[PDB]
Design a protein around this nucleic acid. Sequence first.
DNA 1: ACTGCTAGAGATTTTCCCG
DNA 2: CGGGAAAATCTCTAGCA
DNA 3: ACTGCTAGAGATTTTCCCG
DNA 4: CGGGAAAATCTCTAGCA
Lengths: 65, 65, 47, 47, 249, 224, 249, 224
Amino acid sequence: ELQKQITKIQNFRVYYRDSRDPVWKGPAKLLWKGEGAVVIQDNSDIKVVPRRKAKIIRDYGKQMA
Amino acid sequence: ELQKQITKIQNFRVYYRDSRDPVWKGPAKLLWKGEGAVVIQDNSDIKVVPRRKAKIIRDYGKQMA
Amino acid sequence: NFRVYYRDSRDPVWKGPAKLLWKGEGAVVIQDNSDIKVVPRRKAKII
Amino acid sequence: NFRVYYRDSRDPVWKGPAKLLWKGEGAVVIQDNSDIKVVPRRKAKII
Amino acid sequence: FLDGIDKAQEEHEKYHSNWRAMASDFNLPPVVAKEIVASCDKCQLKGEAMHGQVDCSPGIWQLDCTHLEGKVILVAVHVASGYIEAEVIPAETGQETAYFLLKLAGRWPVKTVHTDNGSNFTSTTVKAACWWAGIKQEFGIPYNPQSQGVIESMNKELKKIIGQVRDQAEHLKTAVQMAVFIHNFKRKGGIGGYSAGERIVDIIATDIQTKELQKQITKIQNFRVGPAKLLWKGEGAVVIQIKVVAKII
Amino acid sequence: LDGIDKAQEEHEKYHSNWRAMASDFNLPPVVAKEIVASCDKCQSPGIWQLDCTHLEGKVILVAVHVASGYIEAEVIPAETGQETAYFLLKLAGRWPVKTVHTDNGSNFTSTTVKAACWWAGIKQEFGVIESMNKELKKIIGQVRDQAEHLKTAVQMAVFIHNFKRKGGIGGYSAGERIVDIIATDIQTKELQKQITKIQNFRVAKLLWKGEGAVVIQDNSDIKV
Amino acid sequence: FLDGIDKAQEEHEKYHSNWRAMASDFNLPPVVAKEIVASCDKCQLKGEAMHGQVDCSPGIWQLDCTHLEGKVILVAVHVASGYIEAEVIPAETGQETAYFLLKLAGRWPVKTVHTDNGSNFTSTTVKAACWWAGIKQEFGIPYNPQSQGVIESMNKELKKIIGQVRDQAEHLKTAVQMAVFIHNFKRKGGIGGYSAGERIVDIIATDIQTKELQKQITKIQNFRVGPAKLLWKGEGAVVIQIKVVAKII
Amino acid sequence: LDGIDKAQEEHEKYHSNWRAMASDFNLPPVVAKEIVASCDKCQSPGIWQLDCTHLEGKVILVAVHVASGYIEAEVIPAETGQETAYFLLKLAGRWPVKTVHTDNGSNFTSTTVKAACWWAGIKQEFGVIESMNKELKKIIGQVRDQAEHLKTAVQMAVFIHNFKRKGGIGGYSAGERIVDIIATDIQTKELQKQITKIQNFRVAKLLWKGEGAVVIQDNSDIKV
DNA sequence: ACTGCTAGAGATTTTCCCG
DNA sequence: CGGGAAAATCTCTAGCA
DNA sequence: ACTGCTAGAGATTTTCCCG
DNA sequence: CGGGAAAATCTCTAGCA
Ligand SMILES: O=C(NCc1c(F)cc(F)cc1F)c1cn2c(c(O)c1=O)C(=O)N1[C@H]3CC[C@H](C3)O[C@@H]1C2
Ligand SMILES: O=C(NCc1c(F)cc(F)cc1F)c1cn2c(c(O)c1=O)C(=O)N1[C@H]3CC[C@H](C3)O[C@@H]1C2
Ligand SMILES: [Mg+2]
Ligand SMILES: [Mg+2]
Ligand SMILES: [Mg+2]
Ligand SMILES: [Mg+2]
Ligand SMILES: [Zn+2]
Ligand SMILES: [Zn+2]
Ligand SMILES: [Zn+2]
Ligand SMILES: [Zn+2]
């Protein structure tokens, strides 16, 4: 159904950045992907990162676990 | 005698730096001043700083206390 | 109301003041002497 | 024994290897092809 | 102490002393001295000590012309992955940049190109190529190369790799293509331990997959949480259309 | 964990590939790969095809990704070995090229192309290219009017073929198809790396070491 | 996996891939791949990511010639305090630098001058002036201006202040002296909230006072703490001749 | 603290300056300054002297710090107002010059020197300079042989006078004397700033606010 | 209304592996 | 749990010209 | 065997002042 | 002790050419 698809879209990792921190934050869990914003979960914190500030990848090092 | 002179030389402040930290550490208390080294007390830590790494001043803002 | 003092193009001198029309993160859009310019926030000071 | 690869004077190319004669904080003294040079540690890599 | 304010004004008109000197010399609170400095136009000579952040969407590229051995190398980078495409062009004309850019847009899904204000990129020829291929043209601040900090950086790396393979090739174009190969497939490290090619493939495949997944998700979920839209329902939070707030329907 | 023997039974009756048994049962890909590799019933992405087409008196190198149809064309000034080697080096730097199929032309068997393939690590081996030369020529004839030179018309045709012509099974374009194929290829290579990394270890073949529970293959029976 | 080591060697001879690419592609531990990279001369192209620290003794000065409006400004800075002395010189000859430096050494207690390798400072004329005045000549690494990072920085500031007072003076030398005045006495802030003049006075007076104080202290204290010398006896530590160690005599 | 009334008694009998009562009794300088300022019995560093000397047909501007003898000389090409203003601006930028004493020469009363003094904030007011011109001329005559031009000989004489000739009370040089005098001047200015900063406060004149114990002057009796 | 970054060299903190 | 070793993260720099 | 720094603009942590 | 405000410290950048 749709729960499998929600788990699938949560299987993706997001490397984001804040407005004034120049270093790339860790691989947050992608909860929702919009046209201009991206909802992530990083360290049990739900953030809304602009689309221009996020690199969303499915790290193919997922072939280990 | 000499205890007054030791207190006098301890009344001086030293702004030093470590070998790989580019920021100037706070005003340690000067315990001893040699030709090549300078013994300081910073945060209850007795350090031996090279002479080339220390700016020793008697901060004339000592006219407050 | 804000004043903006900026650095325009390969010119070491600073100009201003200029009216702040828009402030984004990274750059600003200002209006100086009926000319609209876009200056990075590294090359602009806002009062 | 060490190898030093350095950048000499306004020359973007890197040279080496060179024998490390002295390592201070900030700069090193090396010997390359019977010529002794003094290079900052920003412009030198030691193996 | 407002007479001290007048004296400090009249002395700053001469020496342009900073706020600390005027606060010490005329017994002024730091606010008053800072305002005396902030009212002088001649003392505003330093900008904000920060840096912006370039756009790193999965569809934006950054292009720049570099020079090596008296030849022009037009380079493009995928800002989100570091995947580079470089070509030795016969001239820095816009008619060659339009060809390079149309070729690139045919190879990869280019949605936006960010360039400096070089005549090559500012021309009507590159403007027509972008309109045809459907690309959006973005230009940085004039004479602010930090706006293109990605591609400029890649320039360096590209040249670096060329210096390591310049003697394996007889011509400069062959060495440039060797450097592109080495960067895209023989140098790993980054946000996934990837190479630039693996990373661009991951980025684009992920974009497509997540777009289709979300298009299928929103088509099923119909829950109003004012009457907003449910974006994601969690154990301790509820996202609406975007804040992280409930009366879910 | 609790789905290992279950997936073994499904593969006993349905014989699903490891990619299905992995994501459907939360199994690490190594475990599902050993499940599919322990059966008797169950025991490309880098192949390109090059050719030269002649149009308007110009020579066009056309390279097709046989697995996805993703085309890549370039109007070259001469049908010589140097320009073929340049095209091949460009392509190999752009995409993960592992094998090239050519029609035994004079410009494909030259020493320069051989050296380029040796450098880029390409295997040179001497039906799809014909059909896609026909399709590319049709698209060029369609969009020839919008171009002043033939090279830009060829690039426009390549753009239209790779990103505007959708078809196939699910209605995807050639670009989406090639990026998906290369993504699955990357997954396959990473899984092969993970499998080779733990074949040296003896525990009883090791398959996965999680939090504190190792996955073992003992007597060809997977035992967590 | 030592055959993987041979394959990685033979492939690094071609692509010069970094250690992570060779560790991923050939199943090599990070140490082996890093050693394969570290054995290639062509891959050593980056230096240590650090910075030195200039000598800031109370007797060392840093000198540099800057240029403004087609004229040469010879500037000197007290590295420990930021006290500057600048002069518009008719030429960049060493015969003028020797005069400036002898004048400075006559004004202040100059023990060491640190300069770049400009012909002005490298000459026999400045070498004789330093030998007479008893100054020690130190030269930075050739073409490494960071060794003079203090004075170069001051150059900037000096020019900056000149731009704020250029219209108050009719000549450039008057504006340079105005800038020296403003820097030394009208700009506060630093390690004491001082100006550069107050700071140099504090530095030098403190040097003299502490030298005499220590000369009087060591003349009285005679205590051996091997048989070292007692430098300072504390409640929880004892300094000897220099470590922070007892059997004090 | 416990030494306030004690120091009051010492100043009643010995009348030590505030610098003595401060460091000898651990008193804040404001408290000792109010102690010395509350007595009936007890109720320069920026003065320079300029002149022009003529030697070997050259003109030499000589500026003496009257408080310490620290000399500063410069061979100028002409005895005009412009070069005098330049010398004065140089000096004022180098040292804290507050007052200049001149011999009412044609080059000291010119409008340019007046403008330079107005800009640098110097007060121009129209015995030591004569003796130290004599001493500087003697040193120049001593070291004239070691110089090819007169300007370098003058600078050598200035060096020798400021750092090689030691005398006076404690055997210090002119440079040590001027740096000590300017240091005490800085201490005086900082103490005056501290005194002006807390004369606005009424508690009973405030004198010092330490950890949680304020120092007060009530009915002209200091009360902590 | 737009915007520094990237990869490498050391240093330092975190994690894993055996007892 | 106690370290040792190794991997992961942090810090910082040059060139892009 | 010698060596980036300095001052200013914001941001953020620390301290003080009244209840 | 509880904040608000203010001072002190931290972070980061350009120019030095
Ligand atoms: O300074 C440059 N690089 C070095 C550098 C950097 F990369 C990044 C930084 F943060 C700082 C840097 F110092 C640089 C300068 N220009 C151009 C470049 O591409 C370029 O890289 C360019 O093309 N134009 C055209 C557009 C108008 C005309 C022609 O002047 C500009 C000048
Ligand atoms: O690059 C310079 N400044 C800018 C800068 C800086 F200040 C500090 C940095 F960390 C980085 C910088 F980019 C600079 C270059 N040179 C000289 C300078 O004084 C000077 O400041 C100089 O005098 N010589 C002579 C000695 C041999 C000849 C003549 O070449 C050098 C070249
Ligand atoms: Mg450019
Ligand atoms: Mg560029
Ligand atoms: Mg110089
Ligand atoms: Mg310089
Ligand atoms: Zn001002
Ligand atoms: Zn099977
Ligand atoms: Zn190599
Ligand atoms: Zn009295």
